[PDB]
Each structure stands twice: as C-alpha cells, then as structure tokens.
Amino acid sequence: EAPNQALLRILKETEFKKIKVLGSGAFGTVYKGLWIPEGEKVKIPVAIKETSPKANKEILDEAYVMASVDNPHVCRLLGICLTSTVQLIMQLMPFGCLLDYVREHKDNIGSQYLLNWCVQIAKGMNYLEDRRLVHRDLAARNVLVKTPQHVKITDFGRAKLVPIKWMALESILHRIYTHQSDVWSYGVTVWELMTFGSKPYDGIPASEISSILEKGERLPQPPICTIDVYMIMVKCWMIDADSRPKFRELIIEFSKMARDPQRYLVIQGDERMHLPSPTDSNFYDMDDVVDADEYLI
Ligand SMILES: COC1CCN(c2nccc(Nc3cc4nc(-c5cn[nH]c5)[nH]c4cn3)n2)CC1
C-alpha cells in the first residue's frame, strides 16, 4: 500500500476566534469561527467541532481520514487544536446540511439545483472510491452546502478502507461495507433530495427494514421524479451489489440529465425560482476574509 503523506496541521488556540455555537448534540458542540493564521493578513471562516481517552481516539480517527482527502466535493480538515478537549477545525459551510436546506427552501429549489447536487455527490463519492475509502454513513444530513451551487460530502468517523435506513441489505445482515454499499446510501440520499427532505421509511422501525428490503420493497417514486430518475434510484437498491451503478456512471447519468433538467424533474414553477448566488447583494468586520478553498499552503 501507498504511504499516506498527508500533513496534519496543529493550530494554536490563539490563532482562531469562536464567534458563536451552530449546534449541540451527542458528541459535544459545533461552533462558527474565524481562523487568523500567523501574520498572514487572512481571516478564514471556520467550523470548530468539539475529556475521556475513548472519545479522543474517535475524534482523532476522523481527523486522520479528513486530513487525507482533497477534492472540491469532499470536506478536508484544516487542522486540529490540541486543547484539553481536542477539536477539529474545518471550512465553514455557511448554508448548513443539504437535508435541512431542501426542507427550508423547497419553494425555490429547481430541477437544475437537484440534478447538479446529484452530480456533485457522485463526484465526491467517486473520489473517495479512487482513494479506496468507504464512507459507511452517506446521507443528505452528511452533505454540506458551501453555496446553493456547491455541496460537499462530510462526516467521516465511520469511514474505513448504525444508519439502518441508508444501508445496503448486506450491511444490515452481514456488516459488509463496500463502495457498492455506499451506492445504496447514494440512492437514499437522492431520494431525500427529490422528496425535499422526507424521512425514509417513515414510521417503520429499523428492525423491520431488513425484512422489508428482503421482500422486494423499496422507497417510493417521488412525485417530481420521472421514471428516468427513479430508475437510477432503484438500480442503487439491487440485491446484487455489482448490479448497482458505479459512481463514475452516476456522474455521467446525472450530467446528461442536468443538461435538460425539466425533461427529468417536473417541478411546479421551475426556472422562475432563484437561490442566493455569490453575485448577489450582501451574500457575504469582513475585510481580509478568504474562503478555505482559496487558502492554500
Ligand atoms: C447539531 O447540528 C448542527 C451542526 C452544525 N450546523 C451548521 N450550521 C451552519 C453551518 C455549519 N457549517 C459546518 C458544519 C460542519 N460539520 C462538519 C462535520 C461534523 N461532523 N463531521 C464533519 N463539518 C462542517 C463544516 N461546516 N454547520 C448547525 C446544526
């Protein structure tokens, strides 16, 4: 195997300023902040995720995976700060996760945006495949929005070399995880987008899922989906993992479709819709602010 020559950046507490809290849960808490490196004259908008020996192992495992990735459609680790707590420093994805974005903005989400997101997720996913990485937790909650036109896959820590309703049948029954099992999760993610954030198999308990899938039952055709789009979702949900599409085929399929979006997704009021663009008023003291994607070293 090839040596992982990735750089792990240790960042000083004094190098960054926590602005506020974005959310809390069963891990610690995610903060919004600014990273002002050395005497660089730059302000990088960051997301800071944050004592027991067991919990530090898990967060450092995610740091390992996250520092080993470099792709426009994957979230890379900027660095770690070795405080008493130990925290990951990541790029601020100002618009939050895709799941909540589609729920909050359904009325302005057109076919072009939906299909483009599908292309972007397949591209990120294909990159993880090139890097021999199996996500093991791909879902719309784990896809973040930098801008409405640019999304990235995040949330490693399950990534190697339980979310039942996003899992391939082999993963539920035999704990087998492959790039082809990530394809099943991809199908579910697409379904989450096409339904503007509906919960998969709503009301059905996780213990019933395995047996439901075994019978031949799958997530239903979302109203906006043409048989063309639903056919791709269904192919991701085949029993034979090798029968499922490959992420490189998903990029191709969705790209062809993103060239004529209205032929593949039927949305009342399509094209008349508009989401915030980096060419809009007050889209962004913020003098020397540089996005992490433009801060290289
Ligand atoms: C408890 O739920 C919270 C999670 C953070 N959320 C959020 N709102 C706005 C921007 C943003 N930016 C952001 C979040 C990130 N979360 C990750 C991440 C978390 N675990 N693994 C990766 N990377 C990130 C990069 N930017 N996040 C609000 C709800």
| Ligand 1 center–CA 43 separation, angstroms | 19
User: Given the CA of residue 94, which atom of ligand 1 is nearest to it?
Assistant: 10
| Ligand 1 center–CA 96 separation, angstroms | 6
Looking at the chain, after which residues does the C atom sit over 2.5 Å from the next written N, breaking the chain? 50, 161, 284
Per the rule left: phi > 0, alpha: psi between -120 and 50, beta: everything else, 247 is alpha
Q: How many CB atoms lie within 10 A of CB 151?
A: 28
User: Given the CA of residue 29, which atom of ligand 1 is nearest to it?
Assistant: 1
Q: Do domains 1-92 and 93-282 have the same CATH topology?
A: no
Q: Quick one: resolution in A? A: 2.7
For 288, phi and psi rounded to 5 degrees? -95, 30
The tokens describing 99, both together, are 């799941």
For 273, phi and psi rounded to 5 degrees? -80, 150
**What distance separates the 2 farthest-apart alpha carbons in the chain?**
62
Architecture of domain 1-92 in CATH?
A: 2-Layer Sandwich (3.30)
| Ligand 1 center–CA 47 separation, angstroms | 7
Using CA atoms, how far apart are residues 28 and 26, in angstroms rounded to an integer? Answer: 6
Angle, CA of 252, 255 and 261, to the nearest 5°? 145
| Ligand 1 center–CA 249 separation, angstroms | 29
Give residues (CB < 6 A) around ligand 1. Answer: 22-25, 30, 47, 49, 75, 90-94, 96, 144, 154-155
Q: Where are the domains of the chain?
A: 1-92, 93-282
Using CA atoms, how far apart are residues 81 and 61, in angstroms rounded to an integer? Answer: 15
| Selected catalytic residue, list 61, 70, 130, 137 | 137
Q: Pick the residue whose CA is nearest to atom 11 on ligand 1.
A: 96
The tokens describing 96, both together, are 């939050």
User: Given the CA of residue 90, which atom of ligand 1 is nearest to it?
Assistant: 25
For 235, phi and psi rounded to 5 degrees? -55, -30
CATH superfamily of 93-282: Transferase(Phosphotransferase) domain 1 (1.10.510.10)
* The residue type at 32: K
Three-state SS across the chain? Answer: CCCCCCCCCECCHHHEEEEEEEEECCCCEEEEEEECCCCCCCEEEEEEECCCHHHHHHHHHHHHHHHCCCCCCECCEEEEECCCCCEEEEECCCCCEHHHHHHHHHHHCCHHHHHHHHHHHHHHHHHHHHCCCECCCCCHHHEEEEECCEEEECCCCCCECCCHHHCCHHHHHHCCCCHHHHHHHHHHHHHHHHCCCCCCCCCCCHHHHHHHHHHCCCCCCCCCECHHHHHHHHHCCCCCHHHCCCHHHHHHHHHHHHCCHHHCECCCCCCCCCCCCCCCCCCCCCCCECCHHHCCC
Q: Report how far apart the first and last C-alpha atoms of the chain are (Å, whole number).
A: 26
Using CA atoms, how far apart are residues 86 and 229, in angstroms rounded to an integer? Answer: 43
| Ligand 1 center–CA 18 separation, angstroms | 14
What is the best residue among 19, 27, 30, 158 to mutate for testing ligand 1's pocket, by most ligand atoms within 8 Å of CB? 30
137 counts as catalytic: yes
